[PDB]
PDB file of C-alpha atoms in Angstrom:
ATOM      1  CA  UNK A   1       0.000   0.000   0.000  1.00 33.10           C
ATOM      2  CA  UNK A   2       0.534   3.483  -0.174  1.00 31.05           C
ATOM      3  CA  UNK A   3      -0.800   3.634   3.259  1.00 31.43           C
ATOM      4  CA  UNK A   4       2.072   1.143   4.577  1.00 38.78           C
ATOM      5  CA  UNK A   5       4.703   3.112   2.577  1.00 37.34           C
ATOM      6  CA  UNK A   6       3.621   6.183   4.272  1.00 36.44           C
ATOM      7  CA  UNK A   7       3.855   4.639   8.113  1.00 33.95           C
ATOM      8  CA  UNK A   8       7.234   3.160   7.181  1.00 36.33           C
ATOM      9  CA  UNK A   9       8.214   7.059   6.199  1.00 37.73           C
ATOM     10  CA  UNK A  10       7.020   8.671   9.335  1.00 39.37           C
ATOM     11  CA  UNK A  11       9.074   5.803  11.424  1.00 38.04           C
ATOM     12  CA  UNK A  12      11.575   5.996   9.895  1.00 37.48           C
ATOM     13  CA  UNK A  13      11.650   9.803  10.006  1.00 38.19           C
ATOM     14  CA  UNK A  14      10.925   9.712  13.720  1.00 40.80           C
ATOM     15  CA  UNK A  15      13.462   7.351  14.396  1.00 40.78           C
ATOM     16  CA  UNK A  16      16.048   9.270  12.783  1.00 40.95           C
ATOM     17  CA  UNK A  17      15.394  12.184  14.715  1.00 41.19           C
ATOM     18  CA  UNK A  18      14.804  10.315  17.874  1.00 40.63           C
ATOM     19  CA  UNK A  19      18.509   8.723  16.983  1.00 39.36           C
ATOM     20  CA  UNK A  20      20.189  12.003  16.019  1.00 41.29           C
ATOM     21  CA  UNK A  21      19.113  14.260  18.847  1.00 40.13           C
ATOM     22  CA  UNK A  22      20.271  11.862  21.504  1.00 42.44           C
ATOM     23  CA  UNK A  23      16.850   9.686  22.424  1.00 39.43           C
ATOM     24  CA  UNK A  24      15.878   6.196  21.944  1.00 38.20           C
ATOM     25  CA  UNK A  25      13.877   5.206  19.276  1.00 35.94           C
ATOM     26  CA  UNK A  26      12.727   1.430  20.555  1.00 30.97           C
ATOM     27  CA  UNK A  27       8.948   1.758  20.423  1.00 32.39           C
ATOM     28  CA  UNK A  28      10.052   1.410  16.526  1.00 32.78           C
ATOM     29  CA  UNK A  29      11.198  -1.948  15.335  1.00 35.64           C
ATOM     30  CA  UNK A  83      11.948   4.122  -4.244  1.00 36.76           C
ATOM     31  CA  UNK A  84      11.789   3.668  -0.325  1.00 36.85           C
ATOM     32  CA  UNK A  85      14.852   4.389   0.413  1.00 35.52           C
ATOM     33  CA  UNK A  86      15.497   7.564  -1.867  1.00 38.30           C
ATOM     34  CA  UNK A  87      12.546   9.200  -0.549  1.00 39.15           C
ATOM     35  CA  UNK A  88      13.666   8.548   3.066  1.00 42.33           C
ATOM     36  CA  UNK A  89      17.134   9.638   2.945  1.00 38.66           C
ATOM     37  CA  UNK A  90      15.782  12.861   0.664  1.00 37.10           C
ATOM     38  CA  UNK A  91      13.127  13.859   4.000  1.00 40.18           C
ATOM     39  CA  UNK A  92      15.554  13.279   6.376  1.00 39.17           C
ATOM     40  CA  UNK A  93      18.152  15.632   4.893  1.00 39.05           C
ATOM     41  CA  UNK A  94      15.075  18.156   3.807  1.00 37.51           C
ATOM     42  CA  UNK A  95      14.043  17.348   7.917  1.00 32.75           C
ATOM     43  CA  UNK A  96      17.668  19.005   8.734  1.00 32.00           C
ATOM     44  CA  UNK A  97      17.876  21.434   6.590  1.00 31.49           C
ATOM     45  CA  UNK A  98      14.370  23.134   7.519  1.00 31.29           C
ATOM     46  CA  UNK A  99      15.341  22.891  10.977  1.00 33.00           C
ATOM     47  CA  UNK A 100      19.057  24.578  10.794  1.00 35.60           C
ATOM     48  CA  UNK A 101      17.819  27.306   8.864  1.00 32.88           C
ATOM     49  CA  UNK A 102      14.412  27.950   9.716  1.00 34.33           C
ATOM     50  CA  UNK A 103      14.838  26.851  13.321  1.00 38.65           C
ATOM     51  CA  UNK A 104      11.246  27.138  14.324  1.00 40.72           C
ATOM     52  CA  UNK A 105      10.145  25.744  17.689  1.00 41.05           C
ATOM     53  CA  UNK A 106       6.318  25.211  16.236  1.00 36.72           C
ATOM     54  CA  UNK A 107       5.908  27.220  19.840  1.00 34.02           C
ATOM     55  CA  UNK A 108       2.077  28.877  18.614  1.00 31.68           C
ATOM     56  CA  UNK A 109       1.403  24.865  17.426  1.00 30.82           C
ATOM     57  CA  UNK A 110       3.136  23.196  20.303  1.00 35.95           C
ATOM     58  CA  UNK A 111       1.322  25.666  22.849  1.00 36.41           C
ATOM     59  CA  UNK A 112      -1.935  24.852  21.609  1.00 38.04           C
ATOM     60  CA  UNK A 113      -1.717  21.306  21.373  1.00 40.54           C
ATOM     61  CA  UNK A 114      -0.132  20.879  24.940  1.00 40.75           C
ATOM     62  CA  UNK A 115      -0.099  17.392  24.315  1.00 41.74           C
ATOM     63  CA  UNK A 116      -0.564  14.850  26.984  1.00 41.83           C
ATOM     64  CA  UNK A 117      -1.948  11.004  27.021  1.00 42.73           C
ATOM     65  CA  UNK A 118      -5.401  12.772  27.224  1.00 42.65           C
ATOM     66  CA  UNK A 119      -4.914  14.191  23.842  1.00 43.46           C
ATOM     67  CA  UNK A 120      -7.275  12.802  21.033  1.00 45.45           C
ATOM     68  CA  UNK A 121      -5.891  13.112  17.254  1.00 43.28           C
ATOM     69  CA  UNK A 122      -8.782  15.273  16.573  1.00 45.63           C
ATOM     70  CA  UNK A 123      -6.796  18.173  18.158  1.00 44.69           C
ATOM     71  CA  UNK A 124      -3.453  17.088  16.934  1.00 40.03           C
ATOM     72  CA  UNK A 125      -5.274  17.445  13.689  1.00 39.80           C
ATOM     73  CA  UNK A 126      -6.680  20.757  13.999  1.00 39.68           C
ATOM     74  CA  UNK A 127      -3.530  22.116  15.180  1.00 40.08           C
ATOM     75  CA  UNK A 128      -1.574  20.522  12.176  1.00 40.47           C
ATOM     76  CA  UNK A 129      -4.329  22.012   9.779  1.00 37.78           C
ATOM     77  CA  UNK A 130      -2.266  25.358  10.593  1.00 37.58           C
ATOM     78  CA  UNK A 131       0.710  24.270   8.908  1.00 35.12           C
ATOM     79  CA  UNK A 132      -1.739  24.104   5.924  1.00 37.07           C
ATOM     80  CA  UNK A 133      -4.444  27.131   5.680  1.00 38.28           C
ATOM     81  CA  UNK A 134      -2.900  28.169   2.522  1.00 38.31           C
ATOM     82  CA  UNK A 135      -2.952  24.389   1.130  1.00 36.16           C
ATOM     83  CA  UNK A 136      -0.472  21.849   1.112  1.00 35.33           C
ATOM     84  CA  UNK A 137       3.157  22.168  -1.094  1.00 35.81           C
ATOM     85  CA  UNK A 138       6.785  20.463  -0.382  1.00 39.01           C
ATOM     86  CA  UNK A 139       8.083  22.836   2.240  1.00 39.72           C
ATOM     87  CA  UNK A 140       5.063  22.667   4.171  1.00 42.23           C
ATOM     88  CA  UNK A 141       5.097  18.712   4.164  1.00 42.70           C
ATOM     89  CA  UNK A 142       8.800  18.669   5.715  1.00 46.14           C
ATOM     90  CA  UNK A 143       7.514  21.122   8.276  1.00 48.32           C
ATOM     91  CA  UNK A 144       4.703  18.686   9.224  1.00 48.88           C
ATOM     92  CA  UNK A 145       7.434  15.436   9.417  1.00 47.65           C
ATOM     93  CA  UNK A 146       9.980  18.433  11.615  1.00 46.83           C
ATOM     94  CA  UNK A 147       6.823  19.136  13.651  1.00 47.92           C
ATOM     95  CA  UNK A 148       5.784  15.544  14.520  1.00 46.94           C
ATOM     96  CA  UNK A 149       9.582  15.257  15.307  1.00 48.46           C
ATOM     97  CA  UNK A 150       9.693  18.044  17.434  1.00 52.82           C
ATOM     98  CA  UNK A 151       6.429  16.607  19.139  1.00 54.83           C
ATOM     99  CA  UNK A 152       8.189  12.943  19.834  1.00 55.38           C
ATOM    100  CA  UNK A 153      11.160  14.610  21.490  1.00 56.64           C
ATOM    101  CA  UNK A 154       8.763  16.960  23.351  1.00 55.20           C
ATOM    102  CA  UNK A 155       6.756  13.956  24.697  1.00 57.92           C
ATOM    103  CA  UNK A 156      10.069  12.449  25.837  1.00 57.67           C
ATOM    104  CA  UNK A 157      11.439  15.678  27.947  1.00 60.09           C
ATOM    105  CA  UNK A 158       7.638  15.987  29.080  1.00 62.48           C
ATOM    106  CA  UNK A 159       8.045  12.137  30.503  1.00 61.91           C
ATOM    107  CA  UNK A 160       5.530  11.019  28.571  1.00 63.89           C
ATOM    108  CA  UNK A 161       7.474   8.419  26.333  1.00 63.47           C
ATOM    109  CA  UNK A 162       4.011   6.845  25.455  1.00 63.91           C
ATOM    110  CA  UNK A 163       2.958   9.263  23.066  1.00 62.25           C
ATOM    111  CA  UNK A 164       6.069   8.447  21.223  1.00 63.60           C
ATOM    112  CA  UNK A 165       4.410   5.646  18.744  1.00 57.65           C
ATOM    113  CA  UNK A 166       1.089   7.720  19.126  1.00 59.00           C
ATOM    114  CA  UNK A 167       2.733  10.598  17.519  1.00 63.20           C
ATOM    115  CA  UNK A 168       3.654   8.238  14.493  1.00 61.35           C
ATOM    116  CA  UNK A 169       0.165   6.962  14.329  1.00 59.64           C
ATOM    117  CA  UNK A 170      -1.523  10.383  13.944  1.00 58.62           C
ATOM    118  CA  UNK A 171       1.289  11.411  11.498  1.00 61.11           C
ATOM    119  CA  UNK A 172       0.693   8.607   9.374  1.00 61.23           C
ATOM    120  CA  UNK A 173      -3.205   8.732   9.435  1.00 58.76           C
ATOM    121  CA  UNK A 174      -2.867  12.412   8.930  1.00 59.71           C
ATOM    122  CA  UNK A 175      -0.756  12.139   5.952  1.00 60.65           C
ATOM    123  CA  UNK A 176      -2.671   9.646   4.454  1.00 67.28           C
ATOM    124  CA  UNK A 177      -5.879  11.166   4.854  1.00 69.23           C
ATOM    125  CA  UNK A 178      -4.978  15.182   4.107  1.00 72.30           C
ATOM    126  CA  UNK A 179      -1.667  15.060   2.423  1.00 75.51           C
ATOM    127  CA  UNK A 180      -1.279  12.189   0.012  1.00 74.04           C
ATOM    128  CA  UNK A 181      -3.795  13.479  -2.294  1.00 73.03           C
ATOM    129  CA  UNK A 182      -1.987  16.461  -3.254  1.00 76.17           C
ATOM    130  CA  UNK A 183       1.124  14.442  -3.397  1.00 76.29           C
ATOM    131  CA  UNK A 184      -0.258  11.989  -5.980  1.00 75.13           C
ATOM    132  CA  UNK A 185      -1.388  14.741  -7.880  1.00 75.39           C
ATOM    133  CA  UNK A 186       1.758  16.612  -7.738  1.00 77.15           C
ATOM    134  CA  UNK A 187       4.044  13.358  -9.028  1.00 79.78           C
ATOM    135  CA  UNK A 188       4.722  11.262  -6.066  1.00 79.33           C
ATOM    136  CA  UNK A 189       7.575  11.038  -3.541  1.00 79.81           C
ATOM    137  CA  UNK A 190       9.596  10.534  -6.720  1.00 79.06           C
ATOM    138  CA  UNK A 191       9.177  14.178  -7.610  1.00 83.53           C
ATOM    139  CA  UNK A 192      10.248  15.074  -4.372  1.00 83.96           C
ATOM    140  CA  UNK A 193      13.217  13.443  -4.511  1.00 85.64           C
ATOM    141  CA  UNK A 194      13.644  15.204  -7.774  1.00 81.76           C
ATOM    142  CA  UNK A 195      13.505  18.478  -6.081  1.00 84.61           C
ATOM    143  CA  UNK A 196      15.358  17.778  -2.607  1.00 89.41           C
ATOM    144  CA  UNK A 197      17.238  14.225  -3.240  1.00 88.82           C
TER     145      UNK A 197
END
């Protein structure tokens, strides 16, 4: 499926992030173009824009109590002018930013949560424009 392709990109994006910044990622155990292409586009977004998502991560306040229905409507605001490239890395940066969030919040749970909402999220809202726009291997064209 395109559906399991797009879980296995949000793991493995978590992970990677999880890995790089220091934290475990063990709730986690052409593909691999398109996920070496979002992790460098993840790291690049981040050095230079170097948002902390603070408006986003403010209103979610995310705790175990949190249902994806608000993780969604706080996502949504990465989007009000529709979806494009830059804005998709910013969602994977922002569900990063979430995990590692969750983890200095001590609540390690939401970890593999987090991936779940990303990936029904970006099924649901995001893969339509992506289709239409050429698939991942377009953005590898334009990042990779």
């Amino acid at each position: 499926h395109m559906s399991q392709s797009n879980r296995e990109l949000v793991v493995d994006f978590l992970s990677y992030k999880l890995s790089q910044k220091g934290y475990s990622w063990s709730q986690f155990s052409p593909m691999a173009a398109v996920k070496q292409a979002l992790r460098e586009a993840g790291d690049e977004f981040e050095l230079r824009a170097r948002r902390a998502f603070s408006d986003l991560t403010s209103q979610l306040h995310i705790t175990p109590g949190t249902a994806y229905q608000s993780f969604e409507q706080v996502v949504n605001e990465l989007f009000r002018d529709g979806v494009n490239w830059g804005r998709i890395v910013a969602f994977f940066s922002f569900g990063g930013a979430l995990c590692v969030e969750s983890v200095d919040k001590e609540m390690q749970v939401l970890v593999s949560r987090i991936a779940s909402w990303m990936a029904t999220y970006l099924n649901d809202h995001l893969e339509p424009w992506i289709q239409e726009n050429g698939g991942w291997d377009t953005f590898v064209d334009l990042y990779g």
